[PDB]
Amino acid sequence: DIQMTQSPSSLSASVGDRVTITCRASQSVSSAVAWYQQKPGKAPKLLIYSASSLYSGVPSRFSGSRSGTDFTLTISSLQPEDFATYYCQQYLYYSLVTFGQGTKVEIKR
Amino acid sequence: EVQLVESGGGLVQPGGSLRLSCAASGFNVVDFSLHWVRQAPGKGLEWVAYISSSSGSTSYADSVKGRFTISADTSKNTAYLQMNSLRAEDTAVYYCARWGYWPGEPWWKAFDYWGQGTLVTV
Amino acid sequence: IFVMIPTLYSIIFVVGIFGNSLVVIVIYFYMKLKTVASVFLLNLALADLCFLLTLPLWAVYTAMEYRWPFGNYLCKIASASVSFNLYASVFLLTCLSIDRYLAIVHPTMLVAKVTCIIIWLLAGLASLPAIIHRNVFFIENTNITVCAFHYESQNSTLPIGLGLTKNILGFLFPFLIILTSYTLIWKALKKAYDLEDNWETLNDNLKVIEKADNAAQVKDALTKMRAAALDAQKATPPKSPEMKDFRHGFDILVGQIDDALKLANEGKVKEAQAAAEQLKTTRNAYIQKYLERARSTLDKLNDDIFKIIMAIVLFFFFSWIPHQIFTFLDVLIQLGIIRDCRIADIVDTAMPITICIAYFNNCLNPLFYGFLG
Amino acid sequence: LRLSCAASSYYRMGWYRQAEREFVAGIGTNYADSVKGRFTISTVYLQMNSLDTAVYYCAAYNYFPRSIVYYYVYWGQGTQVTV
Ligand SMILES: CCCCc1nc(Cl)c(CO)n1Cc1ccc(-c2ccccc2-c2nn[nH]n2)cc1
Ligand SMILES: CC(C)CCC[C@@H](C)[C@H]1CC[C@H]2[C@@H]3CC=C4C[C@@H](O)CC[C@]4(C)[C@H]3CC[C@]12C
DSSP, X not given: OOXXXXXXXXXXXXXXXXXXXXXXXXXXXXXXXXXXXXXXXXXXXXXXXXXSOBOSSSOTTEEEEESSSEEEEXXXXXXXXXXXXXXXXXXXXXXXXXXXXXXXXXXXX | OOEEOOBOOOBOOTTOEEEEBOOEESSOTTTSXXXXXXXXXXSOEXXXXXXXXXXXXXXXXXXXXXXXXXXXXXTTTBXXXXXXXXXXXXXXXXXXXXXXXXXXXXHHSTTOSOOOOEEEBO | OOSHHHHHHHHHHHHHHHHHHHHHHHHHHTSXXXXXXXXXXXXXXXXXXXXXXXXXXXXXXXXXXXXXXXXXXXXXXXXXXXXXXHHHHHHHHHHHHHHHHHHHHOOOHHHHHHXXXXXXXXXXXXXXXXXXXXXXXXXXXXXXXXXXXXXXXXXXXXXXXXXXXXXXXXXXXXXXXXXXXXXXXXXHHHHHHHHHHHHHHHHXXXXXXXXXXXXXXXXXXXXXHXXXXXXXXXXXXXXXXXXXXXXXXXXXXXXXXXXXXXXXXXXXXXXXXXXXXXHHHHIIIIIHHHHHHHHHHHHTTSSTTHHHHHHHHHHHHHHTHHHHXXXXXXHHHHTTSOOOHHHHHHHHHHHHHHHHHTTSHHHHHHHHHHHTO | OEEEOOOOOOSEEEEEEEOOOEEEEEEOOEEOTTTTTXXXXXXXXXXXXXXXXXXXXXXEEOOTTSSOTTOEEEOOOOEEOOO
16 A cells, blocks of 8 residues: 655646656565656547656656655656656556546646 | 457446456467456546456455356457446456466566447446 | 974884784785785785885974985885885775675686786885986075976976876876776675565565465555565666566566466455465565675675775775875966965965874784774 | 076076085075075075085975975986086
């Protein structure tokens, strides 16, 4: 029953900014943490299948990291299509799946 | 050409029974474990249940345990989800992701391909 | 400086002679010459003994306020000894660090003997400035005599060249090599400790499974065990034979953990405990070798040969920092880079203190054998 | 007779004679007691008033208590004088 908590509930940033989303696990789950990106009205899309291993077909600006039980997702260049909700999933086992609460990245005005 | 599609979503009275399909293509259910993830309207993703066709093992979330039943069919490439005694908390969009088998890289790619999602309301 | 400096040299002489003589005795009797580290430490003790033999000359010279009555040949020999001590110490410390790195990360007496020969020749050949330059110099018409460092017009840039040789060839390159070796040692120790800690967590949770009643405790212990196994599979030992049986063994282990979790989730406890019991067959078949290697690597840290060399190397390069800074400042002053009168007076009034504290390692190297033995 | 050392040099300068390497003069204004009151040293220049004779060097060293750990004495090419 590992609980994932995302520190930024919302992240208002402008195009070209560097955004970092932090997600923390209650227990140790190894590098079994994945990151998704759900546009409103469609299914999520995998971005970082391991804690820091980028997926295939997604831009190389996304980059994860692990520092124990703290997992961070970073977008170097916040392109206009990178505005969606980002979830962290802990997938240590099939019945132990737990998602984060989401980080709605918005446009800064 | 890999694709997962859902069906069976709709309006059902509370306490009723609903059948959700996950007709897949581009792979076989015997190669991946098909999980069901829901998302309440304007809320976060929640894991519901899963089935492993090879091992025959099915698990359920502690909030849906017993009430829901999940099965699969190798020939049809469908992972049915039988939901009974639906409450007000079960109104959500039910996705159907796929997950690889240990050992190897397919396991580390968790929920790499998701279904289109289907909406059920009570 | 008039009386503070000669007292420290006297203390270094008596303690060093008494100390470095026992180290030779101990190494030749108790810590018998069966390893390269013993040979290198014996050579280091001999170098310290030679420097301490020549030390009372400089003690008397500084006591008399920089007047040298010991002659010209003694003036050059007692400076060649100091230069040789510095160079031999740095070379033997580099050899000791390389020996420790080889013995830890990559588990011959002839090589050690040849290396000692090469070191005692290279230190003597690098102490040639003190042999071909140092001579007694009479300060003007006064009866004062000093052991100066002469150089003609042909032998230009000799002060700058000597300072650079002391800084980069004598200190900087040895320091970089030692830092690289100890960083590699730290990386290997960190990998081994990660593997050992993850397996200790796995074994503790396995024992928890053994003394368990309900499926909830079994499930939690299996969760912790699976996390530990996934973490341990990433702690590949540093240096296909490897990277294919370690990872395969841990894949088998995590598969068995998954089977145990599958049995536990269904409500069965006896079968989950049986699978947890079977989990040690994989250890005895695939992972026991790497666990033994990790414990062996971690066991090369608590021996009383690693702490001695670690203390000797760290103290030596810590005690030479004050002298290397002022020597570098002296080169800048004579290069014309800095002409400040305030800074110039600082360097001249503090150089004797730096050179006095830079050779306290020759005194307290034997003390480490007792403090960490 | 005048000699030059090609200096104009914050160290003490001096002239040494080897007939060995005995002191003659030095400025930073000092003279050897045997030759005191006759030779003049002034930059660096040594001017002769009368004629012993040997090869004269020009050393460039610090003061006595300064930089004693590494005490350098920059010498110069000998210039034998005519008797
Ligand atoms: C702890 C022993 C003190 C040595 C010492 N103190 C004083 Cl003061 C002197 C006078 O020059 N000296 C002589 C001396 C000073 C430095 C060195 C030296 C040290 C390291 C590297 C090179 C040298 C050197 N200097 N000249 N030739 N070699 C050698 C002899
Ligand atoms: C690692 C340890 C052993 C280093 C030794 C301590 C160092 C930092 C100490 C020891 C002797 C000290 C010097 C002793 C004398 C002087 C002259 C004084 O007018 C200014 C400070 C100065 C220049 C000191 C600077 C700091 C100094 C170099």
